[PDB]
């Protein structure tokens, strides 16, 4: 057949390429920074009304101040998520505190490349990684399956990507509130989703200094989703 | 502290006229305690007769593992092995633990089906191989059982008068060893008829 | 883990004003038996250096291997090996104080007392020790074995402290370790009266002396002892 | 390098098939037909060796029946060198579980576990699956008789009455027809060469191109004899059904 | 075409087609400069951003107080080889108490890529970079390319549009070589340089990544307000 | 054990 | 030092082990079951060094209970008895042995039996009327050759391990804090509240 | 040893031997999993293609993990074994060193790491089979039923199905199951599982087994007259 | 046989400060009754504020500095260039000594520095990496010579207010920077007088805000 | 001296503070109380090193249960992650006696005390005095089932005092901690020579002394 | 060493 390493003329890895069309396949994620938090969102979409939506977990905590949402072949993401983990404990272990957002970003890329003839292919999946460190702050990065990680003030990742990524180069500003941000990424996801957006199909969760890594409730999303309709209707 | 002392226990095989007798006490202990009066030490794979003394674990290891190595022999050659070939296995088996070894003293007992010809062998436990025309020994109780077999034996003895000579021989030598005796079993074997005997004896 | 069979004495050394001197002597003994008399215990590395070594002689020769392998490999892909990028006295040292201290770590030591006698890039006098348990120590004077108890005394007494290194000229320096080398040869049932001495200046480079033999002994003394108390013939 | 010459035997077809196993199985569809027959007295293995000569030992011959221990036997259908490998793994772990717990195997452990390394051939290793289809025919005191199927895949079922290797197809139609649950041994040995007799590819059915075994509770009292008949005792079981 | 199937296949004009390819990954790249003097060495990287609300790609990375580099093409590869550089600059120090000449580190860098060339199922590094450094015998830059070709040289650049600053440098060539002393005009003289390179794009604050290395100078690397004194 | 000429 | 005894009655099998665990002079619970439910019908008692008992036993109960739920069926007191000779057979040679006595007591569901084992830490195994391990064996097993009986009811039993455990405590140097008694038969395990 | 990355992506970034082990399980015989409000019930479909069977010894197609978990599956019935065996040996394991025995959700998402890992690891092709796994928590009344598939992707079911003609029977789950309502007792829920194969079965005499599980490790296989019965009533219903 | 172990004698003295520490080290390393150096530098800057000294056998103590000056390098690096704590630098050192836990680094180990707070703080390790933080600590020959004295003189233990008869302590309270280097000069004095293996030379380290600085003060040379 | 008892109120955790090396006081200052989550306490005798070192290596595995499994590790599993490791390098010459503390809904309050020789016991006191381990405690007398939180902390301050005294490598100060249902709380450290002429002067105890 | 309540 052909390397599974290989480069094509053009000077890009094929299988790196080819995982990168698998994650535009996946459901759409989107993650807003701002100076009070860090906001992440992820479409939820069951492929039946049986399926127990609440089972379907694409936002994962990492250590207190790490969260992560994932975009693609979201079984792959398994064992990058158990690596981040151990990763943020074992740093703890050594050093008596947290570690650096960045550091657990590159630490999770460097599983990337790992591929040929270590594991059989590259990762099928890409990851918003939003944290907090003393350092650095709020911070949001995207984790790529090239072992390439970027640090956003806001993204957007899987099939919806390229139209929520231009409404997000619309609307940050360096003054967002956390609540802006949540009804933000409520209103993009709401945009980009096939089905109608409710609590049920979409889920969101936030990183603050004070309160750490939190998945909200249906509860309390669905307020959100309520207080969204009515400012939109307001004008 | 010494392994083939702990359990105790005697075998003696003897050869006679057209026919074999293998017998053994029947105690277990640990030391000076005495466990069990129901621990036979001579096993059967078809007609091959093999008495094992020493550390009780590995003499019933050594019989399921020449179990194991008979049937898988038997289903490849079509036919039960014979004295002088469990032999060789016997010896095989002990000497590639020579720097770990079996803490067991082996009597092999039997008659070739083909030849007709009486036929018994001893161990060491790291597979040497004794193989006497009159008697082998095996035990706490080898020098009591050398020093009986030694005057009481004589050759081409008859089936009947074999099982008296091979008898007086166990019991006397086990009476004088105090960790051997509690019951004894004596094997008179014919070439297509085996007898199988549990003697009276003192239970102290 | 062994025992030293082939054994060196003491290797003796100090700083003076413009360099360092470091000697020892020509004999490696079996036991008390005096085997080989023509045994050469300094190993010059480059013109800057000098290696003196006590102890296993096996273990020597090993060592002596490595520092010839080292100087061999340095110069590869290396177009200043005899200039700016030539091995200096503290990378010669560092190196056997990793390898002993590496050995001792794996319970199977070379059984040696190291001293790394040499002048720097910058004409800075280095002079460090290193032994079998990979223990690291510098001082204005150093010695092994019997001249850490007899040579270091003597020695300190010309440099005491670091400010008697510019105040010591090279003649009184070797004057020293000369006289240091006779004390040995009187008190040291392993010594030889044949030894080498290497001085290493920062002006004129490495002067390397072989078959020295102590001299000017006093022993007339010894005919008006008699007995051990009160003998009179 | 060594990629361009790999066939890749453990890949889906994009039916979601196994290329190699399905093709070992065409391989099995061209060898002698073999029958197990199992009856509430015992069971019955018959096979037919594939076109003899005359010149051929019959009597220290055997390609089809082999002997697993005293309570199993199987029937091949396909490579029988790549069936003696199997073969000897399955007497070394029957072995294994005696000298372990001091009781003969149970039917259905042994199969697993020659099945669970069929499966392995097909999943992972880059090697050939064994071009090899068993019936097994056991007897053990939990389930009594039973008889058992393997194939290159792993998969096995068991069966009242089964035949692996050429014409199973019409084979199974005729045993499917001619069963009962009620059925006896000697019952099972006539249909079984009445069923042989019918599907054979050969002009007529005689004693040097078939290979039998019974697992009959016919042992004095309460214990299982495995008797692999000899040539001259396949000859007269012909004569008594009335095939010659 | 038919022999660049893998890295360990020869064409029918012996060229090695899968390194050709790595060697384009490089022209993909964001240009990097590098200059120097005989006092000190300069790394001048443009730096790629995604789109606004992304950070700009880090392009230069340090090996040790007295070394580092400047990459154009996969990072992570540059990650791998600058890891690989950090160890034989640290077991250089820790062993020999010597730091690693700059000449040296070139040649386990080349050593390294060669391998990857030369055997089955790995594939070349598809990276560039310039390593700066002061050693025993002064300032240094080198060039790597993954075929495993090292090069010494007083400047150059590598990346997109790299051809521009390398003509100006070497028209330069007399003027930068004698700016010692003067860390802040070799600077000025790497900014000019790759400003030959830039279209549409100009300099700004978080563009720009400078990193200088000297007599008594450590690498330091230089982003944000520290760079707008140069623009 | 052990047998020992 | 531990007591655990067994008794092999008509229908069914008694266990009594000390609930006392010491290390030197200190008493570190009075409360212990020194004993593992193997499969429904067969109970494992074990004594020897800290740490190994536990492990051991833990080790078996994981293996039985894996071939209970792969198979569906009750491995045979027999069986299960081989398997853990077979297990402590195979430590004896290893680098660090199991120090650990166990005694095996089932009921054997094909051939409507009970079966006592004692299995020592070298794997020596004897199935027995009545059975025990340590220093207190001596003693039970001359007083259990006088009173025993194959024919014994599990009350009659019950009331023979009674007269063993006080003539312990008597002549017993060490304090073992009194016994836990567990009886195997047709219908499972169950433990004697009252003794 | 044999390390040919035989799950690899595709130009359009799909994985072929992860989709073509979909393609086997597709071929698979339909498997249906429906919780009531206090149950769950795992319902199988037996080809009857296969007569002269043996069905006391054949392998049944509902596995016990645990005496509180089973497993049924569509797909290849020799790959299956292998997923049972590491579940069954996970299920021991978790019980000896966490001294609880797997809750539902663990045991499946160890049986999906076990699957997704089968696609990106060298020399091996993904499991031909997916997956229901059904039980209770320990000390717990609330049902459990989850899915896995080759991918290694795994999630909770109100009621799902897999095999040949599963779409169908999900087309019926989905209009005759109600969220808010559940099968509230045993039977309504067997009846509901029954109904569901009879769409696509062929005949409701040994081609249906049915496999109840209730709280504390509470589970028995339904014999063939107790199934034939229910068949019975469907049908009798179903004729007005 | 072969003894991978020696004892090199000398003395450590780590003092907290309110807004500064001191280590302290005397600078005569020992074999047996011989004197191998009278200065051998036994307290080291290691970076970002932090000061080690690791006592006993000097090849375990050189190669365990050597370690967490490298471990430090290689925080920089993996980082971001983040200054490394001194209860991350402390624990850190616990990681390196319990890796030898089956063949010992056989040192006492005190690091020095200001904690995130900016207050002064002293770290003191045994050998197999057991650590502790501490306002006093002496490690080495003359530990037992110099802590009761600390005690007495630091903490002001068995001290009370004169007129109270023991019914209320002295007041506890921070020492300056002067009045440390006074106890520590007097220590190492007193500890020289009654200890063979302490003498020749006495290096103190001082950790502020400002950075690292160091003082050298003569010991008897007997 | 450790010492963690059960009662109706929780569990009451008192230890000293004193390290030896011989006869040697090496610090009258350690904390041989380690905090492993918000409910979930470990007691440490024998290695300082080997306790600290394994009790924190435990928060950890403790830490990772709670990401994986979103629940919180029960005691039980706690105590036997730790109890698994030391059997691993059982005759290495580990030294630990160890005992672990918490609250959780499904087991309510738990002590276990694992050894270094994989000694794994459920009990509801647990003592360490000296080099003995036992399962009552150092005076027992006064130990009733419906007591007082503020009357257990003293019983378990009034134990650690008692040994601390007749012990020469038990003092320092007592260090108490309360273990409740939603989490364990501080209960401060007491210096044994202030607490010892306290302790005397109120209850009329150590008439042995004289002061 | 090392410290040992």
Same mark, same amino acid.
């Given at each position: ?110 599983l990337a490349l790992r591929f040929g003839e270590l594991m059989s292919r590259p990762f099928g999946v890409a990851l918003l990684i939003a944290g907090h460190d003393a350092d650095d702050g709020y911070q949001l990065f995207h984790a790529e399956p090239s072992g390439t990680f970027y640090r956003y003030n806001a993204k957007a990742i899987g099939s919806g990507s390229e139209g929520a ?71 | ?204 | ?23 020892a002597d020509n004999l490696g003994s079996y036991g008390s038996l005096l085997r080989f008399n023509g045994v050469e215990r300094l190993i010059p590395v480059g013109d800057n250096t000098v290696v003196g070594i006590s102890g296993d002689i096996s273990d020597m020769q090993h060592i002596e291997r490595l520092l010839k392998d080292l100087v061999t490999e340095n110069a590869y892909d ?156 | ?244 | ?231 | ?5 | ?151 014994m009811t599990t009350e009659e039993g019950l009331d023979l391990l009674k007269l063993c455990v006080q003539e312990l405590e008597k002549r017993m140097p060490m304090d073992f804090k009194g016994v836990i008694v567990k009886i195997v038969d047709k219908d499972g395990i169950r433990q004697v509240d009252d003794f | 040893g044999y390390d040919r990355a035989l799950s690899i992506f595709s ?69 299956? +074994?292998? !997923?049972? =065996?590491?579940?069954?040996?996970? *299920?021991?394991?978790?019980?000896? &060193?966490?001294?609880? $025995? ?92 029954? +109904?569901? !194969?009879? =769409?696509?079965?062929?005949?409701? *005499?040994?081609?249906?087994?049915? &496999?109840?599980?209730? $709280? ?25 | ?222 | ?211």
């Open positions: 057949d052909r390397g599974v390493s290989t480069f094509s003329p053009e000077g890009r890895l094929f299988q790196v390429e080819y995982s990168l069309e698998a994650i535009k396949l996946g459901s759409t994620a989107i993650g807003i920074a701002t100076k009070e938090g860090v906001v992440l969102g992820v479409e939820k979409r069951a492929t039946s009304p049986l399926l127990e939506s609440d089972s379907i977990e694409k936002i994962v905590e990492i250590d207190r101040h790490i969260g992560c949402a994932m975009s693609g072949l979201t079984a792959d993401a398994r064992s990058m998520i158990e690596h981040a983990r151990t990763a943020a404990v074992t740093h703890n272990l050594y050093y008596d505190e947290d570690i650096n957002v960045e550091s657990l970003t590159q630490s999770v890329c460097d990524q231009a409404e997000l180069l619309n609307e940050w500003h360096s003054s967002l509130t956390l609540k802006e941000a949540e009804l933000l990424v409520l209103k993009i996801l709401k945009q980009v989703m096939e089905e109608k957006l409710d609590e049920n199909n979409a889920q969101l969760s936030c990183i603050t200094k004070q309160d750490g890594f939190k998945i909200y409730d249906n509860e309390k999303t669905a307020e959100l989703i309520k207080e969204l309709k009515e400012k939109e209707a307001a004008e | 502290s010494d392994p083939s002392s702990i359990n105790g226990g005697i075998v003696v095989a003897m050869t006679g006229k057209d026919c074999v007798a293998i017998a053994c006490d029947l105690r277990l202990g640990s030391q000076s305690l005495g466990v069990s009066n129901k621990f036979e030490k001579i096993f059967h794979y078809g007609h091959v007769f093999l008495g094992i003394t020493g550390l009780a674990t590995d003499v019933t290891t050594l019989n399921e593992m020449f179990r194991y190595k008979t049937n898988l022999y038997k289903l490849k050659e079509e036919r039960a092995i014979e004295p002088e070939t469990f032999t060789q296995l016997v010896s095989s088996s002990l000497y590639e633990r020579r720097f770990g070894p079996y803490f067991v003293g082996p009597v092999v007992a039997g008659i070739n089906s083909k030849s007709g010809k009486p036929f018994i062998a001893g161990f060491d436990l790291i597979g040497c191989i004794d193989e006497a025309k009159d008697f082998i020994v095996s035990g706490t109780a080898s020098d009591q059982l050398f020093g009986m077999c030694e005057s009481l034996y004589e050759p081409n003895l008859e089936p009947e008068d074999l099982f008296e000579t091979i008898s007086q021989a166990l019991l006397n030598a086990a009476d004088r060893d105090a960790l051997s005796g509690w019951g004894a079993v004596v094997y008179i074997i014919k070439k297509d008829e085996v007898v199988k005997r549990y003697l009276k004896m003192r239970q102290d | 883990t062994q025992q030293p069979i082939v054994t060196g004495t003491s290797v003796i050394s100090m700083k003076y004003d413009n360099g360092v001197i470091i000697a290396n177009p200043l090996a005899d200039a700016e990028e030539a091995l200096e006295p503290s990378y010669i040292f560092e190196y056997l104080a990793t390898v002993m201290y590496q050995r001792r770590s794996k319970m199977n030591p070379l059984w040696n007392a190291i001293i790394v006698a040499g002048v720097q890039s910058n004409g800075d006098q280095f002079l460090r020790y290193v032994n079998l348990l990979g223990v690291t120590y510098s001082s204005p004077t150093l010695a092994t074995g019997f001249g850490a108890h007899m040579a270091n005394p003597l020695l300190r007494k010309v440099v005491d402290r670091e400010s008697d290194i510019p105040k010591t000229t090279v003649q009184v320096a070797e004057e020293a370790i000369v006289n240091a080398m006779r004390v040995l040869y009187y008190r040291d049932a392993r010594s030889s009266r044949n030894f080498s001495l290497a001085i290493i200046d920062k002006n004129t480079g490495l002067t390397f002396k072989k078959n020295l033999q102590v001299e000017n002994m006093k022993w007339d003394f010894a005919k008006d002892i008699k007995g051990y108390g009160t003998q009179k013939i | 390098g060594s990629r361009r010459y790999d066939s890749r035997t453990t890949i889906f077809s994009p039916e979601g098939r196994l290329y190699q196993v399905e093709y070992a199985l065409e391989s099995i569809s061209h060898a002698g037909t073999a029958i197990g027959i199992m009856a509430s007295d015992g069971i019955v293995l018959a096979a037919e060796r594939k076109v003899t000569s005359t010149l051929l030992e019959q009597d220290t011959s055997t390609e089809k029946l082999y002997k697993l221990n005293d309570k199993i036997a199987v029937a091949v259908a396909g490579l029988t060198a790549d069936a003696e490998i199997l073969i000897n793994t399955a007497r070394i772990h029957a072995q294994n579980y005696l000298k372990t717990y001091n009781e003969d195997i149970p039917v259905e452990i042994l199969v697993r576990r020659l099945s669970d390394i069929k499966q392995g051939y097909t999943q992972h290793g880059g090697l050939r699956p064994f071009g090899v289809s068993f019936i097994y025919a056991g007897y053990d005191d939990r389930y009594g008789y039973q008889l058992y199927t393997s194939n290159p895949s792993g998969n096995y079922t068991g069966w009242k009455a089964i035949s692996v290797g050429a014409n199973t197809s019409a084979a199974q139609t005729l045993l499917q027809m001619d069963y009962k649950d009620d059925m006896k041994v000697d019952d099972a040995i006539e249909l079984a060469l009445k069923t042989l007799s019918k599907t054979t590819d050969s002009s007529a059915l005689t004693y040097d191109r078939l290979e039998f075994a019974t697992i009959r509770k016919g042992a004095n009292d309460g214990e299982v004899y495995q008797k692999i008949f000899k040539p001259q005792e396949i000859k007269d079981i012909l004569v008594k059904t009335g095939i010659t | 075409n038919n022999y660049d199937g893998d890295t360990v296949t020869f064409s029918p004009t012996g060229r090695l087609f899968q390194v050709e390819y790595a060697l384009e990954a490089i022209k993909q790249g964001s240009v990097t400069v590098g200059l120097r003097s005989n006092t000190h060495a300069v790394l001048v990287a443009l730096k790629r951003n995604a789109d606004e609300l992304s950070s700009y790609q880090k392009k230069i990375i340090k090996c040790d107080e007295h070394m580092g580099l400047s990459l154009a093409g996969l990072a992570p590869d540059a990650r791998v080889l600058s890891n690989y550089l950090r160890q034989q600059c640290n077991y250089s120090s820790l062993v020999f108490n010597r730091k690693l000449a700059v000449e040296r580190a070139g040649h386990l860098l080349c050593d390294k890529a060669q391998k990857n060339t030369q055997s089955y199922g790995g594939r070349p590094y598809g990276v560039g970079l310039l390593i700066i450094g002061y050693d025993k015998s002064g300032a240094h830059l080198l060039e790597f390319q993954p075929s495993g070709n090292v090069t010494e040289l007083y400047g150059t650049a590598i990346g997109a549009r790299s051809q521009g600053a390398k003509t100006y440098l070497e028209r330069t060539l007399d003027t930068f070589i004698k700016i010692d002393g003067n860390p802040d005009e070799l600077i000025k003289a790497g900014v000019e340089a790759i400003s030959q390179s830039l279209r549409d794009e100009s300099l700004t604050v978080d563009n720009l990544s400078i990193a200088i290395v000297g007599k008594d100078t450590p690498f330091t690397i230089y982003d944000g307000e520290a760079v707008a004194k140069y623009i | 054990x052990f047998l020992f000429x | 030092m531990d007591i655990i005894l067994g008794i092999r009655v008509q229908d069914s099998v008694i266990l009594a082990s000390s609930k006392a665990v010491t290390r030197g002079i200190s008493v570190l619970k009075d409360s212990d079951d020194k004993t593992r439910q193997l499969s429904p019908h067969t109970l494992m008692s074990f004594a020897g060094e800290a740490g190994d008992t536990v492990q051991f036993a833990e080790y078996i109960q994981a293996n039985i209970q894996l071939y209970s739920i792969r198979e569906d069926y009750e491995l045979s007191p027999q069986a299960v008895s081989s398997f853990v000779r077979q297990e402590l057979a195979k430590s004896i040679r290893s680098r660090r042995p199991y120090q650990v006595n166990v005694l095996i007591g089932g009921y054997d569901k094909k051939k409507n039996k009970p079966e006592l084992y004692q299995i020592d830490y070298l794997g020596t195994k004897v199935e027995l009327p009545y059975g025990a391990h340590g220093y207190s064996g001596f003693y039970t097993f001359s007083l259990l050759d006088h009173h025993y009986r194959p024919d | 130009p359009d970034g799909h994985i072929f031997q992860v989709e073509y082990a979909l393609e086997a399980v597709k071929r698979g015989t339909c498997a249906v999993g429906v919780k009531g409000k206090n149950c769950v019930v795992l319902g199988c479909e037996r080809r009857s293609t296969l007569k002269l069977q043996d069905t006391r010894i054949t392998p049944s197609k509902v596995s016990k993990i645990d005496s509180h978990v089973v497993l049924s599956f569509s797909g290849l019935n020799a790959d299956s +074994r292998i !997923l049972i =065996e590491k579940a069954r040996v996970e *299920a021991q394991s978790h019980r000896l &060193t966490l001294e609880d $025995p797997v809750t539902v959700e663990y045991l499946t998402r160890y049986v999906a790491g076990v699957q997704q890992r089968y696609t990106q690891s060298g020399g091996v092709r993904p499991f031909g089979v997916s997956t229901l796994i059904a039980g209770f928590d320990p000390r717990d009344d609330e049902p459990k039923l989850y899915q896995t598939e080759p991918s290694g992707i795994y999630s909770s079911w109100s009621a799902q199905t897999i095999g040949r003609n599963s779409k169908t029977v999900r087309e019926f789950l989905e209009k005759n199951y109600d969220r808010k309502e559940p099968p509230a007792t045993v039977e309504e829920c067997v009846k509901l599982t029954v +109904r569901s !194969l009879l =769409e696509v079965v062929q005949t409701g *005499a040994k081609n249906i087994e049915i &496999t109840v599980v209730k $709280p504390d490790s509470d589970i028995v296989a339904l014999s063939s007259e107790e199934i034939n019965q229910y068949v019975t009533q469907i049908e009798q219903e179903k004729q007005e | 046989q072969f003894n991978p172990y020696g004892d090199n004698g000398g003395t450590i003295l780590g003092i907290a400060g309110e807004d500064f520490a001191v280590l302290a080290g005397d600078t005569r390393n020992i074999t047996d009754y011989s004197i191998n150096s009278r200065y051998e530098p036994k307290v080291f800057d290691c970076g970002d504020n932090i000061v080690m000294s690791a006592n006993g056998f000097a090849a375990d103590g050189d190669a365990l500095v050597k370690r967490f000056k490298n471990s430090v390098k290689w925080y920089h690096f993996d980082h971001n260039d983040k200054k490394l704590s001194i209860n991350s630098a402390a624990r850190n050192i616990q990681h390196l000594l319990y890796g030898k836990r089956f063949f010992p680094y056989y040192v006492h180990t005190i690091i020095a520095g200001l904690d995130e707070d900016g207050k002064g703080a002293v770290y003191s390790f045994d050998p197999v990496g057991s650590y502790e933080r501490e306002q006093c600590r002496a490690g080495g020959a003359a530990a037992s010579l110099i802590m009761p004295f600390l005690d007495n003189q630091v903490n002001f233990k068995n001290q009370y207010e004169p007129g109270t008869n023991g019914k209320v302590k002295k007041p506890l309270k921070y020492l300056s920077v002067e009045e440390v280097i006074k106890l520590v000069r007097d220590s190492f004095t007193s500890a020289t007088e009654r200890h063979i293996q302490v003498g020749d030379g006495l290096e103190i380290l001082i950790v502020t805000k400002d950075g690292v600085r160091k003082e050298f003060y003569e010991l008897k040379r007997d | 001296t450790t010492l963690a008892f059960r009662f109706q109120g929780g569990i009451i955790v008192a230890v000293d503070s004193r390290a030896t090396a011989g006869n040697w006081v090496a610090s009258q200052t350690v904390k041989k109380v380690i905090e492993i989550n918000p409910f979930l306490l470990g007691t440490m005798a024998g290695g300082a090193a080997d306790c600290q070192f394994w009790e924190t290596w435990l928060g950890s595995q403790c830490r990772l249960h709670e990401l994986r499994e979103k629940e919180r590790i029960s005691v039980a599993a706690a105590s036997k992650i730790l109890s698994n490791l030391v059997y691993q390098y059982k005759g290495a010459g580990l030294s630990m006696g160890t005992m672990i503390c918490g609250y959780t809904r499904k087991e309510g309050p738990t002590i276990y005390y694992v050894d270094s020789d994989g000694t794994r016991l459920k009990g509801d006191i647990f003592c360490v005095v000296s080099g003995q381990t036992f399962a009552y405690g150092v005076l027992d007398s006064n130990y009733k089932w419906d007591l007082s939180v503020e009357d257990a902390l003293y019983l378990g301050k009034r134990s650690i005092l008692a040994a601390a005294h007749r012990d020469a490598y038990s003092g320092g100060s007592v260090n108490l901690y309360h273990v409740t249902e939603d989490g364990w709380i501080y209960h401060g450290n007491h210096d044994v020579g202030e607490l010892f002429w306290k302790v005397k002067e109120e209850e009329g105890s150590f008439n042995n002394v004289i002061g």
